Amino acid sequence: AQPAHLCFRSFVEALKVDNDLVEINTPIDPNLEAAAITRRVCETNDKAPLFNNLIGMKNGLFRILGAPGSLRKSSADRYGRLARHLALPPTASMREILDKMLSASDMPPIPPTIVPTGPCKENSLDDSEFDLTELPVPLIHKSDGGKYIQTYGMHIVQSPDGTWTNWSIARAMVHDKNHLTGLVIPPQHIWQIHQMWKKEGRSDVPWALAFGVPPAAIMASSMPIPDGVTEAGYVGAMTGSSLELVKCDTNDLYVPATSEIVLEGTLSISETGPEGPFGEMHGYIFPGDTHLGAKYKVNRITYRNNAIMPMSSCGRLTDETHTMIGSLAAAEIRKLCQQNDLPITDAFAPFESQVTWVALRVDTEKLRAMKTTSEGFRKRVGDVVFNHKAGYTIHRLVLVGDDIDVYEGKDVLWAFSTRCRPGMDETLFEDVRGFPLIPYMGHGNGPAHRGGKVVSDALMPTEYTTGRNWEAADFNQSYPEDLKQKVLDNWTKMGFS
Amino acid sequence: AQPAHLCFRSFVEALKVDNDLVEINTPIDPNLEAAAITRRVCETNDKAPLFNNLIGMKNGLFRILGAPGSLRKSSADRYGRLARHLALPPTASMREILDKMLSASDMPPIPPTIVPTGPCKENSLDDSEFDLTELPVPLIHKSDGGKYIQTYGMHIVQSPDGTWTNWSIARAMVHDKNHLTGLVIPPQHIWQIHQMWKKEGRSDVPWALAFGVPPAAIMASSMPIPDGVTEAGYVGAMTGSSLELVKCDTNDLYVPATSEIVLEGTLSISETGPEGPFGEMHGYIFPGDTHLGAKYKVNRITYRNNAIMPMSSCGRLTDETHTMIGSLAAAEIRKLCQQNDLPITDAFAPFESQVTWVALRVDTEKLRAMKTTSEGFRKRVGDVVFNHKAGYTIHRLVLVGDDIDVYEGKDVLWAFSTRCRPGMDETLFEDVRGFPLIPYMGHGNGPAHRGGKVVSDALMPTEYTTGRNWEAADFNQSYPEDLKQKVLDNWTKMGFS
Ligand SMILES: Cc1cc2c3c(c1C)C(C)(C)C[C@@H](C(=O)Cc1ccccc1)N3c1c([nH]c(=O)[nH]c1=O)N2C[C@H](O)[C@H](O)[C@H](O)COP(=O)(O)O
Ligand SMILES: Cc1cc2c3c(c1C)C(C)(C)C[C@@H](C(=O)Cc1ccccc1)N3c1c([nH]c(=O)[nH]c1=O)N2C[C@H](O)[C@H](O)[C@H](O)COP(=O)(O)O
Ligand SMILES: [K+]
Ligand SMILES: [K+]
Ligand SMILES: [K+]
Ligand SMILES: [K+]
Ligand SMILES: [Mn+2]
Ligand SMILES: [Mn+2]
């Protein structure tokens, strides 16, 4: 066999073939050691670790793959892990990756295909046979409030009426032998669907959590595609293939046939339990900061022979919470802007901003034809984005003109720092949903859930009127073409590197 | 040999010895080519170029050294050029460099020593014998409004009463055979002294411009040491040695004995001429943006045999306008804060901010004892800094706690992005002097000369009260010491780089 983008086991193979995998066959402790190695990998853009000999692995549960969506060292294949989720060449640009993830947005869905069995059915454990506290679930950060089994699996929940099945990543930790607790927060789709079941009031939410799903599916799971859109059919259109799914044993949900590990059960409409703290995407943990979270009951586990659990050891740069959350949100924001008739060509969440900013590249020819001003345009952009779920995680939008490559953080920083006058060239948004996970929100001086957002206009005045009126004081723009070429051609002759 | 910090010719030797120099002995055009090579050096942190065969060099005037204060590639000796200005080991940290530049602030001055002659007297040209338009003055950027002879020399002017002699860098370009035009703007000391002569009204300002001065002198020339303080005596205290100076031939000013090239003349109290545009430190040139500047008359040139003119090809990162202007301003700001009883331990202007920000590291134990709040503390800090000349070039101050290394831009960006809530955690300053060279000031939407400043508080709430209440979600802080060491010790064994 199955292609890498359609089968996690094949994806692991692909990373090996790529010389992008280190297989660790000696015993590794899931209590911190696996996550520490993965953390170091993510901080240094090293090869992904596959822990084949995890202390506590029994009867096939489980090996761990760390850093599944993290960066490679080389510039040429920096995003190659992400490309391997999507059948793209390993040298694919971020633009190419994001365009692939947006491609299904004006295609008919390709609904999934139901097949009678698959590798995820190779082994099973009923509710007399498993204990979640006895599995080699990792402690990811030393101060975490639980062992976070769920950092890179896919929650599956369906609206009561059956018309929308959502796939998404949301964290969860082990509560006891047969329960998890996790985040289920607005405006996320798992929360939206949970609210539908709670208003109906009759039962707990049928649920499954599938780990080691098709890589193309985990990417859509991490993207804020629209309300009401079933991720499986979006992935089918993106990949050009209907995804093969098998029915759960204990409920009527459907999971990818090649899932490594599947939990089946219910998400309670009534019960909560302690959740967190967790070392999070912005780079912090607040020890002792436990709060009630949603509570999941597990009734059944099914799994592949020699099952592999993917794990995100998230925190400071760079891991899946940056490469996927930020970039995929930025992609959806780009599309949302264009659908609102805003002249945005590109969007990216700079890593340097801890993926709390999105830089929006403006087609300034189109802007000029709008015959508008900074104040008006900033407000329009911020209203569109900050009032929408796709903008949830993003607290600063930086508008830049056509000369800036938004996928290059040094260039975004240059433009922000030199073209946006603090205060005057910004519009603050206090009456929008805020992202409480940012430390200055949930642990800050103001409301955790509201405000703290800004549109920073790094468009220069003449970009709204007559056109750019500067040249950069750089090698590229400050010297004629023939001179530049001469200098390059004589560079090593003269004595330079 | 004479020591490198005391003699520019010896400094050039030192860069060669260091394998930090490329001697270009074939013909190089001062019309763009020399500056293009230097620009490329600065953008890539390559070796400094010494142009020994400059097209248009005659009778000893002149060779060019580019990139005298720019960065080296290696992290270990990144600031080695700057260290070579100061007699410091080439591996000196930025903290060490800035401490050396601040050291003379609580020492008695060591006034200069007058000697009868020096190398700067080896050759001379009277006012019948030179023509500035006939010298190989560089065109530094293709759209510059003149040939900028003066990018790394030292202007010397003295108060009418004789009590203060200032040394400073300010740009100047050739106007005609015997005149320059340049920037002389408030609140700079050359401007302050010029205003004293203008109020006296009796004559033009006696002036000299010395190129290829002692490196320790050019560093102080680039630093905003206090009003009324004679740089020569500050440099003498910093270096532990009295600087040797020779009298000008045509006026009673005194220049370093080993200056490569000296212009003697007057800075007019009445005349102006076209100046600019110039490709500037923030990374831009605005073609055609010429304005009246100060006008200098040159009466005499003296120079060393085989004179070398230093040149800054300034613009986008990284050159002297970043490494020296930003860092030296930040050093003075650190001291100014401490003298105002503010608990600041360190300051640096991040390169990523185009040296428009300064990050201020706070001793949070001291902060806690102040029993203050963010609003109050931000306002106090901003009032101190933004009302002072040392703050002139800086538009954003970022307050950070003790965990942040302000000399590491990635860590400043992380703290700013995650700990400062836009709007609420900031105080805007509109009634302070602004720096018009920033594009969003002089080419922006508001007053060029006023406002546009902000204090951004990236201190978290408990840093004012009870202490830091988080751990970073990073390898260093999220795992115990013994585990970290194990992972490091087994890193290459396991298969990692
Ligand atoms: C790639 C990744 C993604 C998330 C998360 C992590 C990783 C690796 C982990 C599990 C490592 C961290 C965790 C987070 O702590 C970060 C976070 C992000 C956004 C909201 C809350 C938490 N998390 C997560 C997340 N969404 C969350 O609702 N709680 C979560 O727990 N997300 C983001 C989420 O998938 C996206 O917002 C999707 O758009 C959601 O799908 P839809 O609702 O649009 O269908
Ligand atoms: C290292 C360097 C420094 C400057 C400049 C350049 C370089 C390489 C060049 C010449 C390349 C660029 C030019 C600039 O265009 C940048 C600039 C900076 C600050 C004000 C105006 C211009 N410039 C300069 C500068 N000061 C200026 O008053 N006009 C100047 O022309 N400075 C800064 C100035 O030296 C410092 O502010 C000192 O504190 C001044 O001394 P005191 O007044 O405190 O005694
Ligand atoms: K999703
Ligand atoms: K602007
Ligand atoms: K000075
Ligand atoms: K703050
Ligand atoms: Mn969804
Ligand atoms: Mn001075």
UniProtKB/Swiss-Prot annotation, chains A, B:
Phenotypic consequence of residue 280 to Q: Abolishes catalytic activity
Gene Ontology CC: cytoplasm
Catalytically driven reaction(s): (E)-4-coumarate + H(+) = 4-vinylphenol + CO2; (E)-cinnamate + H(+) = styrene + CO2; (E)-ferulate + H(+) = 2-methoxy-4-vinylphenol + CO2
NCBIfam families membership: UbiD family decarboxylase
Listed name of the protein: Ferulic acid decarboxylase 1
Family: Belongs to the UbiD family. UbiD-like/FDC subfamily.
Residues holding prenylated FMN: 166-171, 188-189, 231, 389
SUPFAM superfamilies documented for this protein: FMN-binding split barrel, UbiD C-terminal domain-like
Record keyword Cell inner membrane present: no
Requisite cofactors: Mn(2+); prenylated FMN
Originating species: Aspergillus niger (strain ATCC MYA-4892 / CBS 513.88 / FGSC A1513)
Catalytic residues as annotated in Swiss-Prot or TrEMBL: 280
Membrane spanning stretches: none
Gene that encodes it: fdc1
Result when mutating residue 275 to Q: Abolishes catalytic activity
Keywords recorded for this protein, A-Z: Cytoplasm, Decarboxylase, Flavoprotein, FMN, Lyase, Manganese, Metal-binding
Residues that coordinate or bind Mn(2+): 166, 189, 231
Superkingdom classification of source: Eukaryota
